[PDB]
């Protein structure tokens, strides 16, 4: 009954509808990790990133998705493969 906080980088090349696929090519990365009890935080200030030059209105979805451990390499890697995430981060959250 894990529960791990999904910070989420959205690609700063993206307009702002494909930035909603990017947020859809998330999603369905984050359902292939699992659907237990989710709360959704969309950060726009979180400018904090490698690619800051283009990414200082901070666009990082946070997912709170509780589900089973074993797929945090899915998710990182469904996450991460994308070409519309700038960067994806797994910290472990109260259960």
């Given at each position: 009954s894990k529960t791990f906080e999904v910070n989420i980088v959205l690609n700063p090349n993206l307009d702002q509808k494909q930035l909603a696929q990017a947020k859809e090519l998330a999603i369905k990365a984050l359902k292939q990790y699992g659907i237990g009890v989710e709360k959704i935080k969309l950060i726009?200030?979180?400018?904090?990133?490698?690619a800051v030059e283009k990414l200082k209105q901070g666009i990082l979805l946070v997912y709170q998705i509780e589900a089973p451990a074993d797929r945090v390499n899915d998710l990182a890697r469904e996450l991460r493969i994308?070409?519309?995430?700038r960067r994806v981060e797994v910290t472990y959250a109260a259960d």
């Open positions: 726009g200030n979180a400018k904090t990133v490698e994308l070409d519309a995430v």
